[PDB]
Design an enzyme around this catalytic site. Structure first.
Site, PDB file in Angstrom:
ATOM      1  N   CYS A   1       0.787  -1.167  -0.003  1.00 28.35           N
ATOM      2  CA  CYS A   1      -0.169  -0.084  -0.044  1.00 28.35           C
ATOM      3  C   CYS A   1       0.960   1.252   0.086  1.00 28.35           C
ATOM      4  O   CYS A   1       2.147   1.211   0.618  1.00 28.35           O
ATOM      5  CB  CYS A   1      -1.049  -0.019   1.135  1.00 28.35           C
ATOM      6  SG  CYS A   1      -2.062  -1.535   1.261  1.00 28.35           S
TER       7      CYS A   1
ATOM      8  N   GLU B   1       1.231  -3.532  -5.620  1.00 26.71           N
ATOM      9  CA  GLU B   1      -0.037  -4.253  -5.536  1.00 26.71           C
ATOM     10  C   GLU B   1      -1.352  -3.679  -5.988  1.00 26.71           C
ATOM     11  O   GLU B   1      -1.429  -2.443  -5.691  1.00 26.71           O
ATOM     12  CB  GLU B   1       0.158  -4.943  -3.981  1.00 26.71           C
ATOM     13  CG  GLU B   1      -1.085  -5.909  -3.803  1.00 26.71           C
ATOM     14  CD  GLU B   1      -1.074  -6.252  -2.079  1.00 26.71           C
ATOM     15  OE1 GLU B   1      -0.158  -6.269  -1.573  1.00 26.71           O
ATOM     16  OE2 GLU B   1      -2.346  -6.503  -1.785  1.00 26.71           O
TER      17      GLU B   1
END
Ligand SMILES: C=CCOc1cc(C)c(F)c(C(=O)NNS(=O)(=O)c2ccccc2)c1
Ligand code: NA
Ligand SMILES: [Zn+2]
Length: 268
Positions: free
Chosen positions: A140, A174
Protein backbone atom coordinates in the site's frame (compact mmCIF):
# COMPACT_ATOMS: atom_id res chain seq x y z
CA UNK A 1 -20.60 5.76 13.93
CA UNK A 2 -17.10 5.95 12.40
CA UNK A 3 -14.06 8.17 12.71
CA UNK A 4 -14.75 10.98 10.25
CA UNK A 5 -12.16 13.60 11.27
CA UNK A 6 -8.64 13.49 12.64
CA UNK A 7 -6.28 16.05 14.09
CA UNK A 8 -2.62 15.24 13.46
CA UNK A 9 0.24 17.64 13.93
CA UNK A 10 -1.24 20.97 12.89
CA UNK A 11 -3.69 19.48 10.35
CA UNK A 12 -7.36 18.65 10.58
CA UNK A 13 -8.25 16.05 7.95
CA UNK A 14 -11.64 14.62 6.95
CA UNK A 15 -11.79 10.83 6.54
CA UNK A 16 -12.41 9.20 3.15
CA UNK A 17 -13.21 5.62 4.24
CA UNK A 18 -14.04 3.43 7.21
CA UNK A 19 -11.05 2.45 9.36
CA UNK A 20 -11.54 -0.13 12.18
CA UNK A 21 -10.52 2.01 15.14
CA UNK A 22 -12.20 0.62 18.29
CA UNK A 23 -15.86 1.54 18.65
CA UNK A 24 -15.39 4.01 21.52
CA UNK A 25 -12.84 5.92 19.42
CA UNK A 26 -15.16 6.15 16.41
CA UNK A 27 -17.99 7.61 18.50
CA UNK A 28 -15.91 10.71 19.25
CA UNK A 29 -16.41 13.76 16.99
CA UNK A 30 -12.67 13.83 16.26
CA UNK A 31 -9.69 11.51 16.72
CA UNK A 32 -6.42 13.08 17.86
CA UNK A 33 -3.14 11.56 16.69
CA UNK A 34 0.39 12.18 17.86
CA UNK A 35 2.24 12.97 14.65
CA UNK A 36 5.44 11.28 15.93
CA UNK A 37 4.37 8.04 17.66
CA UNK A 38 0.91 7.81 16.00
CA UNK A 39 -0.87 7.10 19.28
CA UNK A 40 -4.56 7.88 18.74
CA UNK A 41 -6.56 9.63 21.46
CA UNK A 42 -10.21 10.47 22.15
CA UNK A 43 -9.97 14.01 23.54
CA UNK A 44 -8.17 17.27 23.02
CA UNK A 45 -7.11 17.14 26.69
CA UNK A 46 -5.48 13.73 26.48
CA UNK A 47 -3.82 14.89 23.24
CA UNK A 48 -2.39 18.03 24.91
CA UNK A 49 -1.04 16.04 27.83
CA UNK A 50 0.51 13.51 25.47
CA UNK A 51 2.23 16.20 23.42
CA UNK A 52 3.95 17.56 26.53
CA UNK A 53 5.04 14.07 27.61
CA UNK A 54 5.85 12.25 24.36
CA UNK A 55 9.56 12.24 23.62
CA UNK A 56 9.35 10.97 20.02
CA UNK A 57 10.28 13.55 17.41
CA UNK A 58 10.55 11.17 14.43
CA UNK A 59 9.44 7.67 13.33
CA UNK A 60 11.08 4.63 14.94
CA UNK A 61 13.35 2.26 12.97
CA UNK A 62 16.41 3.37 11.04
CA UNK A 63 16.75 6.47 8.85
CA UNK A 64 17.76 4.83 5.56
CA UNK A 65 17.51 8.06 3.56
CA UNK A 66 18.32 11.65 4.38
CA UNK A 67 18.89 14.56 2.03
CA UNK A 68 18.44 18.07 3.39
CA UNK A 69 15.14 17.89 5.35
CA UNK A 70 13.65 14.89 3.47
CA UNK A 71 13.90 11.63 5.37
CA UNK A 72 12.76 8.00 5.03
CA UNK A 73 12.61 5.61 8.00
CA UNK A 74 12.47 1.85 7.56
CA UNK A 75 10.28 0.27 10.25
CA UNK A 76 10.01 -3.51 10.57
CA UNK A 77 6.47 -4.52 11.47
CA UNK A 78 7.64 -7.21 13.92
CA UNK A 79 9.93 -4.79 15.81
CA UNK A 80 7.49 -1.85 16.10
CA UNK A 81 4.11 -3.55 16.11
CA UNK A 82 1.96 -0.90 17.82
CA UNK A 83 3.42 1.91 15.71
CA UNK A 84 2.79 0.02 12.47
CA UNK A 85 -0.75 -0.89 13.52
CA UNK A 86 -1.52 2.76 14.25
CA UNK A 87 -0.03 3.68 10.88
CA UNK A 88 -2.24 1.14 9.11
CA UNK A 89 -5.37 2.44 10.89
CA UNK A 90 -4.48 6.00 9.86
CA UNK A 91 -3.77 4.88 6.29
CA UNK A 92 -7.09 3.03 6.07
CA UNK A 93 -8.95 6.33 6.56
CA UNK A 94 -7.67 7.31 3.09
CA UNK A 95 -7.36 3.95 1.27
CA UNK A 96 -10.40 2.05 0.07
CA UNK A 97 -8.64 -1.23 -0.74
CA UNK A 98 -6.28 -1.71 2.20
CA UNK A 99 -7.36 -4.73 4.25
CA UNK A 100 -4.57 -5.54 6.71
CA UNK A 101 -4.12 -3.42 9.85
CA UNK A 102 -3.12 -5.63 12.76
CA UNK A 103 -1.04 -8.44 11.19
CA UNK A 104 1.88 -6.14 10.42
CA UNK A 105 4.74 -8.57 11.16
CA UNK A 106 5.13 -9.68 7.49
CA UNK A 107 5.61 -6.04 6.37
CA UNK A 108 8.29 -3.40 6.35
CA UNK A 109 7.07 0.22 6.38
CA UNK A 110 8.90 3.15 4.79
CA UNK A 111 7.83 6.44 6.41
CA UNK A 112 8.40 9.69 4.51
CA UNK A 113 8.98 12.75 6.70
CA UNK A 114 9.67 16.44 6.13
CA UNK A 115 11.94 17.82 8.88
CA UNK A 116 12.12 21.19 10.63
CA UNK A 117 13.44 22.46 13.96
CA UNK A 118 10.62 20.79 15.93
CA UNK A 119 10.90 17.31 14.39
CA UNK A 120 10.27 15.00 11.44
CA UNK A 121 6.66 15.41 10.27
CA UNK A 122 4.93 12.48 8.59
CA UNK A 123 3.84 12.93 4.98
CA UNK A 124 3.07 9.38 3.87
CA UNK A 125 4.42 5.86 3.67
CA UNK A 126 4.44 2.69 1.71
CA UNK A 127 4.36 -0.85 2.99
CA UNK A 128 6.17 -3.76 1.40
CA UNK A 129 5.94 -7.50 1.97
CA UNK A 130 9.21 -8.88 3.34
CA UNK A 131 8.67 -11.82 0.97
CA UNK A 132 6.38 -11.14 -1.98
CA UNK A 133 5.54 -14.26 -4.03
CA UNK A 134 3.93 -11.97 -6.62
CA UNK A 135 6.87 -9.61 -7.08
CA UNK A 136 5.11 -6.65 -5.47
CA UNK A 137 7.58 -3.93 -4.47
CA UNK A 138 4.78 -1.94 -2.77
CA UNK A 139 1.76 -3.28 -0.88
CA UNK A 140 0.00 0.00 0.00
CA UNK A 141 1.17 3.55 -0.69
CA UNK A 142 -0.50 6.54 0.95
CA UNK A 143 0.20 10.29 0.97
CA UNK A 144 -1.85 12.21 3.54
CA UNK A 145 -4.36 14.51 1.75
CA UNK A 146 -2.71 17.89 2.54
CA UNK A 147 0.55 16.62 0.96
CA UNK A 148 -1.02 15.03 -2.13
CA UNK A 149 -0.15 16.26 -5.64
CA UNK A 150 2.96 18.01 -4.29
CA UNK A 151 5.75 15.66 -5.42
CA UNK A 152 5.84 13.42 -2.33
CA UNK A 153 3.96 10.54 -3.94
CA UNK A 154 6.38 10.60 -6.88
CA UNK A 155 9.27 10.52 -4.40
CA UNK A 156 7.92 7.40 -2.71
CA UNK A 157 7.26 5.66 -6.04
CA UNK A 158 10.81 6.47 -7.18
CA UNK A 159 12.09 5.31 -3.79
CA UNK A 160 10.31 1.95 -4.06
CA UNK A 161 12.03 1.28 -7.39
CA UNK A 162 15.43 2.33 -6.00
CA UNK A 163 14.98 -0.44 -3.44
CA UNK A 164 14.04 -2.87 -6.23
CA UNK A 165 17.19 -1.88 -8.15
CA UNK A 166 19.35 -2.63 -5.11
CA UNK A 167 17.59 -6.02 -4.85
CA UNK A 168 18.42 -6.73 -8.54
CA UNK A 169 14.73 -7.43 -9.20
CA UNK A 170 11.76 -5.88 -10.96
CA UNK A 171 8.58 -5.01 -9.09
CA UNK A 172 5.11 -3.54 -9.38
CA UNK A 173 2.64 -2.04 -6.88
CA UNK A 174 0.02 -4.41 -5.55
CA UNK A 175 -3.34 -3.95 -7.26
CA UNK A 176 -5.83 -2.38 -7.14
CA UNK A 177 -4.37 1.11 -6.94
CA UNK A 178 -6.32 4.10 -5.72
CA UNK A 179 -7.51 6.50 -8.41
CA UNK A 180 -4.76 9.01 -7.58
CA UNK A 181 -2.25 6.16 -7.26
CA UNK A 182 -2.96 4.96 -10.81
CA UNK A 183 -2.49 8.42 -12.29
CA UNK A 184 0.70 8.86 -10.26
CA UNK A 185 2.28 5.57 -11.32
CA UNK A 186 1.42 6.16 -14.99
CA UNK A 187 2.97 9.63 -14.80
CA UNK A 188 6.06 8.30 -13.06
CA UNK A 189 6.44 5.43 -15.52
CA UNK A 190 6.06 7.76 -18.50
CA UNK A 191 8.63 10.27 -17.30
CA UNK A 192 11.21 7.62 -16.37
CA UNK A 193 10.86 5.71 -19.65
CA UNK A 194 10.80 8.87 -21.78
CA UNK A 195 13.91 10.27 -20.08
CA UNK A 196 15.72 6.97 -20.63
CA UNK A 197 14.68 6.96 -24.30
CA UNK A 198 15.86 10.57 -24.71
CA UNK A 199 19.33 10.00 -23.23
CA UNK A 200 17.07 0.13 -25.76
CA UNK A 201 14.67 -2.79 -25.77
CA UNK A 202 11.71 -3.27 -23.44
CA UNK A 203 13.88 -5.75 -21.54
CA UNK A 204 16.69 -3.17 -21.36
CA UNK A 205 14.36 -0.51 -19.95
CA UNK A 206 13.18 -3.05 -17.37
CA UNK A 207 16.68 -3.89 -16.14
CA UNK A 208 17.56 -0.19 -15.97
CA UNK A 209 14.43 0.93 -14.09
CA UNK A 210 13.13 -2.18 -12.23
CA UNK A 211 9.76 -1.44 -13.85
CA UNK A 212 8.16 -4.69 -15.00
CA UNK A 213 7.96 -5.41 -18.71
CA UNK A 214 4.17 -5.43 -18.44
CA UNK A 215 4.11 -1.96 -16.87
CA UNK A 216 6.59 -0.70 -19.47
CA UNK A 217 4.46 -2.12 -22.28
CA UNK A 218 1.20 -0.70 -20.93
CA UNK A 219 2.92 2.68 -20.48
CA UNK A 220 4.41 2.63 -23.99
CA UNK A 221 0.98 1.64 -25.34
CA UNK A 222 -0.63 4.68 -23.74
CA UNK A 223 2.11 6.77 -25.38
CA UNK A 224 1.62 4.92 -28.70
CA UNK A 225 5.32 4.04 -28.72
CA UNK A 226 5.17 0.27 -29.31
CA UNK A 227 4.65 -1.86 -32.41
CA UNK A 228 3.53 -5.49 -32.51
CA UNK A 229 5.46 -8.00 -34.63
CA UNK A 230 4.76 -11.75 -34.70
CA UNK A 231 3.65 -11.92 -31.08
CA UNK A 232 6.20 -9.48 -29.62
CA UNK A 233 5.84 -5.91 -28.36
CA UNK A 234 8.64 -3.77 -29.86
CA UNK A 235 9.57 -0.17 -29.02
CA UNK A 236 8.84 2.16 -31.94
CA UNK A 237 9.75 5.78 -31.28
CA UNK A 238 11.80 8.59 -32.77
CA UNK A 239 13.96 10.86 -30.61
CA UNK A 240 11.81 13.77 -31.78
CA UNK A 241 8.60 12.07 -30.59
CA UNK A 242 10.20 11.41 -27.18
CA UNK A 243 11.05 15.11 -26.88
CA UNK A 244 7.56 16.34 -27.76
CA UNK A 245 6.08 14.20 -24.97
CA UNK A 246 8.74 15.21 -22.45
CA UNK A 247 8.15 18.92 -22.73
CA UNK A 248 4.41 18.65 -22.28
CA UNK A 249 3.07 20.52 -19.28
CA UNK A 250 2.61 17.50 -16.99
CA UNK A 251 6.40 16.91 -16.85
CA UNK A 252 7.14 20.49 -15.73
CA UNK A 253 6.95 20.38 -11.91
CA UNK A 254 10.47 20.02 -10.45
CA UNK A 255 10.57 16.68 -8.62
CA UNK A 256 11.90 15.83 -5.21
CA UNK A 257 14.57 13.49 -6.43
CA UNK A 258 15.81 10.30 -4.80
CA UNK A 259 19.57 10.81 -4.56
CA UNK A 260 20.99 7.29 -4.61
CA UNK A 261 24.06 8.67 -2.82
CA UNK A 262 21.88 9.45 0.23
CA UNK A 263 20.28 5.98 0.31
CA UNK A 264 21.76 3.82 3.09
CA UNK A 265 20.30 0.41 2.43
CA UNK A 266 21.51 -3.14 1.94
CA UNK A 267 19.17 -5.74 0.40
CA UNK A 268 17.86 -8.46 2.78
C1 LIG B 1 -4.35 8.51 -0.36
C2 LIG B 1 -4.14 7.42 -1.12
C3 LIG B 1 -2.99 7.36 -2.12
O1 LIG B 1 -2.24 8.54 -2.04
C4 LIG B 1 -1.25 8.70 -3.02
C5 LIG B 1 -0.58 7.60 -3.58
C6 LIG B 1 0.38 7.82 -4.55
C7 LIG B 1 1.13 6.66 -5.18
C8 LIG B 1 0.68 9.12 -4.95
F1 LIG B 1 1.63 9.32 -5.88
C9 LIG B 1 0.02 10.20 -4.38
C10 LIG B 1 0.33 11.62 -4.81
O2 LIG B 1 0.30 12.51 -3.98
N1 LIG B 1 0.64 11.89 -6.18
N2 LIG B 1 0.94 13.16 -6.64
S1 LIG B 1 2.51 13.57 -6.95
O3 LIG B 1 3.34 13.18 -5.85
O4 LIG B 1 2.71 14.98 -7.05
C11 LIG B 1 3.11 12.79 -8.44
C12 LIG B 1 3.46 13.57 -9.53
C13 LIG B 1 3.93 12.97 -10.69
C14 LIG B 1 4.05 11.59 -10.76
C15 LIG B 1 3.70 10.81 -9.66
C16 LIG B 1 3.23 11.41 -8.49
C17 LIG B 1 -0.94 9.99 -3.41
NA1 NA C 1 -9.64 17.55 4.74
ZN1 LIG D 1 3.45 10.45 20.84
Amino acid sequence: KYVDKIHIGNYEIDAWYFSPFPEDYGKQPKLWLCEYCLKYMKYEKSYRFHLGQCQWRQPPGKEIYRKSNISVHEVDGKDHKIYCQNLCLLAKLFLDHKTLYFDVEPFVFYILTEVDRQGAHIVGYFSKEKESPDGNNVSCIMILPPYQRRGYGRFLIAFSYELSKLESTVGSPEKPLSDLGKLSYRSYWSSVLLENLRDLSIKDLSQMTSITQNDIISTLQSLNMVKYWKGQHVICVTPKLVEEHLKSAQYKKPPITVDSVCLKWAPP
